[PDB]
Ligand binder design. Structure first.
Ligand SMILES: CCCCCCCCCCCCCCCCCC(=O)OC[C@H](COP(=O)(O)OCCN)OC(=O)CCCCCCCCCCCCCCCCC
Ligand SMILES: CCCCCCCCCCCCCCCCCCCC
Ligand code: SF4
Lengths: 60, 149, 100, 314, 101, 198
């Protein structure tokens, strides 16, 4: 290919090298499961239960 | 109801487009930015989990409305996500989408004109890439999309 | 301490083995294999002769010999590829249309 | 049975055995470090739970490969199928066999050196060819033909890249190559030789960005043989680049082995960065870069090196 | 010189232990655990590699003794490298090294 | 209690053979290589677990081989369609011993919501399954929890060290279920956060 295309390609690869290194120098975003428990919102749709009334009897 | 549905649709559209861009970058040969794109998808999933209670299939729209109201704190999470997104988008673009190898692998591959898109029913990004400005959100407005700039 | 005669006998044995493989095999690939065996045997004999006299001329003609062997193997394998491309078989007895 | 010659024999054999064991363990632990550094490069932690710092993960992989059921295809040629991982291991192991780690700590002080490395590179492409053919698979055969053509296209100028360094050194011996770097490291005059040798060494080890595969049918300890052989090859290429372009063991303050290991680890981390960052160029682009660009560059570099070294030879 | 024979023995045990270690690694892998048309461009690339590797070996022989060969050796290898580059340019231009169509 | 595959048979486990089986089990759980097989939504959450936010790689399960001969664990993550069931069976038969199965999501568990003409009602209809995850889809940390469950089931199973000696049958422990194990702490839950907040 042309020399200008080669120099642009080498520049883009060196820029990718530098950006991946700067990603390496960043802060981790990994949740430490199971050691760090997963935060779940109050209306998260997980395990089903049957609940009770305030008097103590089952609501169903 | 219309604004809530538009907001949820745009959040999921951003999620799907992020996945598409990251998977294309991985399929060309750069496997790094799909991880950060999935972190951004995790932020979107945090907001969608807070609003609808589920990550990927919310089952939240109802006939005549939505299943619940917006929880107190949806605007804070939306603001945090909107602050998060543009720097990551620029980072992915400059790291991968402006690189020469992916451009050479992608440009000039399986091209077609407006006639091929029309006769084959091609829609979405391909049809508008052929120069036909046909979007459903503009031509046949729905869900109050005429009130958005 | 190593006789020149013994290396010459080893090279001659390799040469006659390559010649026998060149003669008895009617597949063209084994004929080319035999040709490389003989040219390597002659190169080995030349190296033995050069090392007996303590001269670099044996290794120099070894270099010329392996250059010839490389180019000749390239030409022979191109001809073998052409034969397999047009006739779909490597029978050296099939190329006998010129006789008399 | 006490004599200086016999104890020198035994001690030198012990140094060679220690070098061999340290090299194979360094290749295996640096495959584990490849996983860890890829995790670091993409903002993760990688394997860090199996043992203190994740160092016991490699033993778990070795146990899994050892106690996996050994599977060979019935229609495949058993001898070549067995032999290809053997070559892919041993070729780059004895390619390392010439590298001087420290003054007084060498395996073989040969009069050829990087010539022996070139023979080991030829054996490596033999390993790739044998692995492709022995699988009894057309797809793996075609993939091996492509990979072997690429390996040839970069092995064709690997030696000419090293030619400027040996031409300045004036001898094929590696100790003389290092001793010619006592005042200036060879990376400064042979910059083009350095980049061409780096590209060629990455390509002959089939490391990214130079990787219907020919590894699909391999399983059990043969696949582990392929991994430890290729990672030993990464170690060998890094140590060769250190000892041929970055002064080898020469350093101001630290012990020579410390400087050599630091430069080798820097080049290993550089190889992990090359794996993590660069996308994969297409095959035709890769071989056109191998033939059109780098080989004339090595030829011109050798000519300029000869002209310079004759200009200063008053 | 005991150092030379010591290095020869070190190379011998290095070779033997490396090959045997790979052998016993394969043996231990087998022993343990229960059980229950290609185009001519390939030829052209290999041929070009062979020819340029022989010309490379000529340059290998040159480069180790550049200083005592003098400037005459330099101009000789200049003609050699110019012939190599002319052949390479000839191969590139006609499409011998062009894999893509 | 254990069960055999060549019935219920007690624990057979010399101490050196016991330590050798323990270290084999340790190396097998701490190095589990999943197979890159995609069916449906649950595979999207599988590759979500492989990414940077979740980092499956801490378990040593990121190697993620593209050939079934090199894989130790098959994660069926998606729907077992009628056309895809022979592909699943052939892929599982291409594997080598030892091979475990993690069923991910409701479709691979039972057929899920798709009680339809073109869906096989559970992957256990034709291939044996070791772990099941409820979910549609399971979140990536649920897949992580199943990975640890498979590690626990692996670490107390008995397999032959070699084919030259010993019993050649496999012994998988009849594990106590997670339901009856966690019933003590699950019923004691009294109050939860109201769904009107974040
Ligand atoms: C499957 C097995 C296939 C066969 C594998 C090998 C089998 C034999 C293994 C045992 C070898 C025993 C030791 C051999 C001698 C070692 C020492 C030696 O070569 O010394 C000779 C020479 C000395 O040179 P120098 O140190 O400079 O001395 C100054 C001048 N007196 O130094 C030299 O001349 C150095 C150059 C020769 C080095 C040869 C190294 C081995 C080459 C073959 C590798 C094969 C790899 C496996 C197959 C690959 C696929 C085909
Ligand atoms: C990646 C590096 C691989 C190196 C393989 C060979 C290792 C040899 C180690 C030799 C150690 C002793 C060196 C001489 C003594 C000076 C240092 C003493 C403390 C180590
Ligand atoms: S269980 Fe649900 S999420 Fe998983 S494949 Fe089926 S429909 Fe998709």
């Amino acid at each position: 290919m042309t020399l200008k295309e080669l120099l642009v390609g080498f520049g883009t690869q060196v820029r990718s090298i530098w950006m991946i290194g700067l990603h390496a120098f960043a802060k981790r975003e990994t949740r430490m499961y199971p050691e760090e428990p997963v935060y779940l919102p109050p209306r998260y749709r997980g395990r089903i239960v049957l609940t009770r009334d305030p008097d103590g009897e089952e609501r169903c | 109801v219309n604004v809530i549905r538009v907001m949820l649709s745009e959040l999921f559209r951003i999620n799907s487009h992020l996945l598409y861009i990251s998977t294309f970058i991985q399929d060309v040969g750069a496997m790094t930015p799909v991880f950060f794109a999935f972190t951004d998808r995790q932020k979107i999933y945090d907001l969608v989990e807070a609003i609808t209670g589920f990550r990927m299939h919310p089952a939240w729209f109802r006939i005549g409305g939505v299943a619940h109201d917006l929880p107190r704190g949806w605007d804070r999470l939306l603001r945090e996500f909107l602050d998060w997104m543009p720097k990551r988008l620029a980072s992915y673009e400059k790291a991968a989408l402006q690189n020469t190898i992916l451009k050479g692998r992608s440009q000039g591959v399986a091209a077609y004109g407006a006639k091929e898109a029309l006769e084959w029913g091609t829609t979405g990004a391909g049809l508008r890439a052929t120069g036909i400005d046909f979007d459903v959100r503009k031509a046949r407005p729905y869900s109050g999309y005429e009130n958005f700039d | 301490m190593i006789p020149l005669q013994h290396g010459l006998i080893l090279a001659a044995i390799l040469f006659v083995l390559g010649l026998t493989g060149l003669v008895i095999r009617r597949n063209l690939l084994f004929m080319l294999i035999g040709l490389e065996i003989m040219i390597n045997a002659s190169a080995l004999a030349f190296v033995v002769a050069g090392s007996y006299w303590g001269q670099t001329d044996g290794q120099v003609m070894y270099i010329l010999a392996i250059s010839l062997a490389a180019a000749e193997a390239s030409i022979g394998l191109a001809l073998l590829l052409q034969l397999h491309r047009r006739r779909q078989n490597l029978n050296i007895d099939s190329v006998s249309e010129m006789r008399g | 049975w006490i004599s200086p010659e016999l104890i020198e024999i035994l001690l030198t054999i012990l140094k060679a055995v220690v070098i061999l064991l340290v090299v194979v363990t360094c290749g295996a632990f640096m495959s584990f470090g490849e996983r860890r550094l890829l995790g670091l490069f993409q903002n993760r932690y990688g394997p860090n739970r199996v043992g203190w710092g994740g160092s016991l993960q490699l033993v778990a992989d070795m146990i899994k490969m050892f106690f996996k059921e050994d599977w060979i295809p019935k229609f495949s040629d058993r001898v070549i199928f067995t032999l290809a991982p053997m070559i892919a291991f041993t070729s780059l192991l004895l390619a390392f066999a010439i590298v001087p780690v420290s003054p007084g700590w060498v395996v073989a002080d040969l009069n050829i050196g990087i010539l022996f490395f070139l023979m080991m590179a030829g054996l490596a492409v033999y390993a790739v060819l044998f692995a492709g053919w022995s699988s009894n698979n057309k797809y793996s055969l075609l993939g091996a033909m492509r990979a072997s053509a690429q390996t040839l296209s970069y092995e064709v100028f690997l030696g000419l890249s090293l030619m400027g360094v040996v031409a300045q050194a004036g001898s094929f011996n590696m100790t003389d190559i290092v001793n010619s770097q006592a005042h200036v490291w060879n990376v400064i005059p042979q910059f083009f030789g350095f980049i061409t040798f780096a590209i060629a060494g990455v390509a002959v080890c089939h490391r990214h960005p130079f990787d219907d595969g020919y590894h699909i049918e391999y399983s059990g300890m043969k696949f582990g043989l392929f991994f430890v052989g290729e990672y030993i090859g990464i170690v060998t290429i890094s140590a060769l680049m250190v000892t041929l372009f970055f002064g080898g063991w020469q350093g101001p303050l630290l012990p020579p082995f410390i400087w050599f290991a630091l430069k080798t680890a820097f080049f290993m981390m550089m190889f992990i960065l090359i794996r993590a960052s660069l996308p994969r160029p297409r095959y035709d682009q890769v071989m056109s870069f191998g033939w059109k660009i780098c080989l004339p560059l090595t030829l011109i570099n050798l000519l300029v090196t000869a002209a310079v070294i004759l200009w200063q030879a008053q | 010189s005991t150092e030379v024979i010591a290095h020869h023995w070190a190379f011998a045990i290095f070779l033997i232990v490396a090959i045997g270690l790979c052998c016993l690694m394969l043996v231990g892998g087998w022993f343990l655990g229960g059980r229950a048309r290609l185009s001519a461009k390939f030829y052209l690339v290999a041929m070009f590699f062979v020819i340029f590797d022989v010309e490379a070996l000529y340059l290998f022989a040159w480069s180790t003794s550049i200083r005592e060969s003098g400037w005459v050796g330099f101009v000789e290898a200049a003609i050699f490298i110019f012939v190599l580059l002319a052949g390479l340019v000839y191969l590139v231009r006609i499409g011998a090294l062009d894999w893509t169509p | 209690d254990y069960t055999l595959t060549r019935e219920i048979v007690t624990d057979p486990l010399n101490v050196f053979m016991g330590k050798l089986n323990d270290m084999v089990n340790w190396g097998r759980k701490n190095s589990i290589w999943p197979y890159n097989f995609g069916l449906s939504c649950c595979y999207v959450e599988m590759v979500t677990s492989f990414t940077a936010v979740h980092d499956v790689a801490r378990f040593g399960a990121e190697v993620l081989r593209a050939s079934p001969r090199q894989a130790d664990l098959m994660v069926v993550a998606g729907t077992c369609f009628t056309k895809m069931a022979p592909v699943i069976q052939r892929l599982y038969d291409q594997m080598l011993e030892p091979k475990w199965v993690i069923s991910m999501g409701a479709c691979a568990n039972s057929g899920g919501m798709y009680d339809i003409y073109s869906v096989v009602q559970g992957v256990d209809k034709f291939i044996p399954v070791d772990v099941y995850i409820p979910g549609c889809p399971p979140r990536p940390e649920a897949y992580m929890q199943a990975l640890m469950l498979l590690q626990e089931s692996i670490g107390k199973e008995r397999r032959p060290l070699s084919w030259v000696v010993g019993d050649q049958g496999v012994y998988r422990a009849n594990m106590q279920s997670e339901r009856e194990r966690k019933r003590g702490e699950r019923i004691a839950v009294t109050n939860l956060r109201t769904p009107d907040e974040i």
